[PDB]
Amino acid sequence: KLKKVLDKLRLKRKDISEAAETVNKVVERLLRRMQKRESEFKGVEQLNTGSYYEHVKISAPNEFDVMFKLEVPRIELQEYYETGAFYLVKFKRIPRGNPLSHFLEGEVLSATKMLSKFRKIIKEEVKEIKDIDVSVEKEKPGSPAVTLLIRNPEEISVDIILALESKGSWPISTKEGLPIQGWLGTKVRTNLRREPFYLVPKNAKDGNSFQGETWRLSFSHTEKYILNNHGIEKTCCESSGAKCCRKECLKLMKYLLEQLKKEFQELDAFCSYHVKTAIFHMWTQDPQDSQWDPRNLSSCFDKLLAFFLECLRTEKLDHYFIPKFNLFSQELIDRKSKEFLSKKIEYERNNGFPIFD
DNA sequence: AAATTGCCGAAGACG
DNA sequence: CGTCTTCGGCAATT
Ligand SMILES: Cc1nn(-c2nc3ccccc3[nH]2)c(O)c1[C@@H]1OC(=O)c2ccccc21
Ligand SMILES: [Zn+2]
Numbered sequence: 001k002l003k004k005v006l007d008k009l010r011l012k013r014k015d016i017s018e019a020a021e022t023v024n025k026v027v028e029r030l031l032r033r034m035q036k037r038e039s040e041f042k043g044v045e046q047l048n049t050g051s052y053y054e055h056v057k058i059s060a061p062n063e064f065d066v067m068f069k070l071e072v073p074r075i076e077l078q079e080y081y082e083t084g085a086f087y088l089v090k091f092k093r094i095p096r097g098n099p100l101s102h103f104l105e106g107e108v109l110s111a112t113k114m115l116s117k118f119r120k121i122i123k124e125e126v127k128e129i130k131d132i133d134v135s136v137e138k139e140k141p142g143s144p145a146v147t148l149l150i151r152n153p154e155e156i157s158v159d160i161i162l163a164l165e166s167k168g169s170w171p172i173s174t175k176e177g178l179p180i181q182g183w184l185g186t187k188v189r190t191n192l193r194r195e196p197f198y199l200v201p202k203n204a205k206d207g208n209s210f211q212g213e214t215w216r217l218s219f220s221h222t223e224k225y226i227l228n229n230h231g232i233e234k235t236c237c238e239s240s241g242a243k244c245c246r247k248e249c250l251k252l253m254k255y256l257l258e259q260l261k262k263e264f265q266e267l268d269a270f271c272s273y274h275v276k277t278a279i280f281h282m283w284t285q286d287p288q289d290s291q292w293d294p295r296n297l298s299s300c301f302d303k304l305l306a307f308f309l310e311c312l313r314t315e316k317l318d319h320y321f322i323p324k325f326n327l328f329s330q331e332l333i334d335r336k337s338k339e340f341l342s343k344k345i346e347y348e349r350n351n352g353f354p355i356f357d
Numbered sequence: 358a359a360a361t362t363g364c365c366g367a368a369g370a371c372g
Numbered sequence: 373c374g375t376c377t378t379c380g381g382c383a384a385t386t
């Protein structure tokens with residue numbers, strides 16, 4: 001039953017090929033545009049992130065995330081209040097002549113300025129694209145992404161995400177995050193935390209407005225590693241190892257949410273990342289590959305449903321990397337919203353998930 | 358040195 | 373289930 005739904009969600013190779021060919025042409029052209037002289041973003045490098053590059057994208061290959069990461073040396077971070085995720089950015093000594101001089105605000109590096117110039121450079125390059133149907137989606141507050149809309153003639157979106165790369169140690173609000181010691185282990189955890197961290201220009205929402213200079217922590221690179229290296233046994237899902245159903249559970253939960261979101265706008269505040277975060281905790285909670293045997297698919301899905309409902313009910317979903325940050329706090333999602341999503345989930349759970357059709 | 362090339366894991370396709 | 377395939381990611385190389 002759940003296998004038959006997975007078959008439907010599975011992407012088709014001809015679709016992948018058609019989408020990939022077009023997406024790669026467009027992105028590689030922006031990247032090189034960004035590589036150009038006079039640009040502030042001259043040293044940006046590409047990093048592919050998100051559902052598609054983690055092999056957890058469902059239904060159609062119609063959404064692509066790409067991080068244009070910029071190695072910015074020597075930055076001091078100041079925690080924006082006690083959020084743990086959001087930050088103001090200063091430089092240690094002024095870099096003499098600085099490519100990012102123009103994005104400054106006294107001593108603070110404005111995310112809004114830097115994104116706006118990034119967006120402007122992308123918009124100008126996209127207008128020059130003639131062989132392909134592409135446009136830049138209207139800017140949306142609360143988004144670090146400059147979003148492309150491609151008609152291939154299939155509708156494809158590409159989120160291009162400016163990121164600052166910092167090679168220093170991770171900010172202390174992450175110090176008790178990534179609790180993978182009993183699962184992927186301490187060598188993996190330590191090694192992952194020796195990798196750079198990223199800031200993306202998603203602004204903290206003060207109240208009714210955004211704080212235009214703030215940045216947000218991104219662990220999209222770390223998450224991608226984990227999705228590809230997700231078992232306690234090194235050979236999980238390898239050619240001389242056992243297949244598990246961890247990713248299949250993520251896809252089923254992703255689908256259940258996306259179906260509910262399509263017809264209920266009371267659910268607009270929720271999104272895939274809530275689901276991904278929840279399954280990260282599941283994987284931590286049940287680290288043994290044996291617990292995610294494909295034959296146990298139904299009960300792993302139901303256990304994930306159960307955990308998620310409990311997160312809704314208690315209004316608490318800890319960010320996996322930043323445990324202070326509650327993705328289900330009253331302040332980000334109203335109680336009523338969470339209670340709405342609960343009853344719909346419970347209903348689909350006690351009725352054999354009719355919405356899967 | 359920006360771009361090509363070589364390698365192979367992840368996973369779709371098919372019997 | 374096995375085998376074949378395309379895509380993605382890496383970094384050595386020219
Ligand atoms: C609600 C949400 N949070 N979120 C998110 N919060 C983070 C905090 C710290 C680090 C990464 C985060 N990603 C995140 O990626 C989303 C969804 O991704 C979005 O771009 C988005 C947009 C509208 C609603 C929900 C989301
Ligand atoms: Zn596995």
